[PDB]
DNA sequence: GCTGATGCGTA
DNA sequence: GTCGGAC
DNA sequence: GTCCGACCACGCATCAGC
C-alpha cells in the first residue's frame, strides 16, 4: 500500500483494492499527483475522465470528507467564484520560494525556468532535512493554498513564500511539480470544469456515495452492456452538468450530492438569485450568409453589440442586491451607483429578479457612449457613490428570474416580454438593448451600419422562439454575434516583426510569439506597436522559426524603438511583414507607435491581435505607417 | 510616503 | 475576444 | 463541433524596497 506506485489508470480498477490509503485515513497528495500524472500521460479526454473518476471513486468510497478538496485541487481553484479568493503568487515569488527551497541563485533557477518553460520541473528536478517531513495530504495541501490566499498586508509576501518552502521540502516524487504548477495558476491538466464534472458524475454513479464501509456496491455498471452503460453515464452526466450550471458552487452541491444522491439533486439545488451563473455566450458569423443556415426556419431578433462589461444583476427577496461579472466574481462593491438606481428600474410589483445586462461607460454632458477603455478606469475596490467620475449606463437585454420563478426553460419572446413589462427605461441610466426583429437580408445590414455608428461593436442576433431558451449545459453559445471584423471589411494592419519571444509549456523551446512594429516616416523609425501570439498553426510557427533563424541579432537596430515594451528574447533584423487583425485600437501607456499623433503622451496599440498571413510582397518599407495608424484609430470616432 | 514590479480580472 | 491541437 | 490552454492590451490594487 505505497502510493509511489498508485495507479488510477489501471484496468478493472477496484475503488478499494487499488487505493493507496487505508480507509478513513486522509487522502495522500501523492494519490492526486499520481492521478494527475496518469492524466497528463494520455491526450484523449475520454480516458482522462475515467482515470480521474477512479481517484474520485476511491475518495467517495473511503474518505468522503476529502471529496471537496480533491475536486478543488483538480480544478486548481480555491473555492466558490463569488468569494474572490486569489493566491496572489506569481512566477517571481514562486521562484524565490523554489530557490530558497533548494539553494541556488534567483537568476540561476530563473534561467532554468524560461528555457524549460515550466516551473514545476524546475521545482522537482532540483534537490530538505535528513528528516523527510511527514508526507503531504490533500486536505492539508488544499488548506495551505487558502492559507496563502488569506495572507495580506505588510510582509505578507514573506509569509507567502514561507509556506511554499514548506510544501516543497515536504514533497515526494512528482508532488513538487503539480504543486508548483497550481500555485503558478497554470495547472494545465487537460481537464477543466466540464471534465472534472464528467469524472465526478461517473464516480458517484459507478460507486454510489453514503455506503456503509466496506461498500457492497463497488461497480454499479456491471450488469449493463456497453451501449447500456454508456448512455446511462451520459444521462447522469447531463443531470450533474445542468444542475451545476444553475448552481455552480461546489461548497453547496457536494453536501447535497452526498446526502440525497445524484438523481434527486435537481430538486434540492434550485436556480436562485444570490449565486453567480455563467452567462450565455455566442458564436461569430461570417456574415448574413451564415445566419440563415444556422437559424434556418426561425424568427430572430437583432440587438446592438455593446462595448462594455457584462454585468448580471441579482435581486433577492428582501432587497439584497448583488452584481456579478461574467466570471462569477462579485462586482457589487464596484457599482454603488447601480445599487442606488435599483428602485427606479423595477415596477414595485417586482420582488425578486435576475437581469442580463451590459454596463457601458456613459457621458452625461453629451448623452453618448464612451468606449470600453474609459469604463476600465472605474475603481474596483469599495467605492462611495459620491466619487464616481465615470458614469455607467445599464443595457438590460434578458431576464432570468422574476418573482420566485426561473425563466430558464422558456423562449426569448417570453423572457423579453416580461422584461419589457416589469422594468422601466430611464435614458442614460437603464434601457433595453436598441433592437429590431426582422428577417430581410438587407434592412438587417442597414441596422448594423447604424449600430456601429452608435459606438457599438456590431450586432447580436437571437432566436425568438425556436430553441430560444437559456440552459447553458446542452450548449453555451447559442445566439450569433455579427461583428464588423469577422466579415473583407475588417481593417487589418501590415506590421513589421522586430523580435521574437520564447514559448511556455506546449510551446516551450520554439518561438512563442513576436513583437511587431509600424513604420514612422517622420523620424524614419520602426515603433513597436504590440506583441503577437495568437493564431498561427504549429507548422506555420516553424515556417517562421526557419525563416527568421537567419535574422537573429544580439542588439537592437538603432532605428527601432520599443519604449517600455517587453524586451524580445531574440531581436530580429527587421524584415518580416505580417497581416495582423485586431478588434479595436487603443491609447497605449507603453507602446510608442504613433505617439504624439493623437495624444501628447501615448502611442497606440492593438486590442486582441491575431496573425492572418505573411506578406512576402511587402518590404518593411511598405507596411502600415504610424501616420496611417493614427488615422485608423481616429476612424473609431 | 512614494514608486516600480507585478498579480488579477475587465476586455 | 479568436486561435489551433487533438480528440 | 467540443473541450482545453494558449495568446494579447490595459488599468486598479497591492506590496517590497527605498
Ligand atoms: N446585446 C447583447 N446581448 C448579449 N450579449 C452582449 C450584448 N452586447 C454585448 N454583449 C457581450 O459582449 C460580447 C460581444 O462580443 P464581440 O466579439 O465584441 C458578447 O459575447 C457578450 O458577452
Numbering used by the authors: 261 to 387, 391 to 750, 752 to 901
Which of the paper's sentences describe this entry?
However, in the structure of the LIG1/nick DNA duplex containing an A:C mismatch, we showed that the ligase active site exhibited the LIG1-adenylate conformation, where the active side lysine residue (K568) was covalently bound to the AMP phosphate. This refers to step 1 of the ligation reaction. Our results indicate that LIG1 stays in its initial adenylated state and cannot move forward with subsequent adenyl group transfer to the 5′-P on the downstream strand to activate the ligase for attack by the upstream 3′-OH of the nick DNA. These observations suggest that the A:C base pair imparts the active site conformation that suppresses the further chemical steps of catalysis. The distances between the ends of the nick DNA for A:T and G:T were 2.1 Å and 2.8 Å, respectively. In the LIG1/A:C structure, the 3′-OH of the nick DNA was rotated 50° from that of LIG1/A:T. The overlay of both structures demonstrated significant differences in the conformations of the 5′-strand due to clear shifts in the positions of the −1G, −2T, and −3C nucleotides relative to the upstream DNA. Moreover, the position of phenylalanine (Phe) at 872 (F872), which is located upstream of the nick and positioned close to the deoxyribose moiety of the nucleotide at the 5′-end, shows an important difference between the LIG1/A:T and A:C structures. Notably, superimposition of the structures in placement of the wobble A:C mismatch and the cognate A:T base pair at the active site of LIG1 demonstrated the shift in the position of F872. The interaction interface between R874 and the −2T nucleotide of the downstream DNA showed a change in the LIG1/A:T versus A:C structures. On the other hand, LIG1 discriminates against A:C mismatch with a large distortion of 3′-OH and 5′-P ends at the nick.
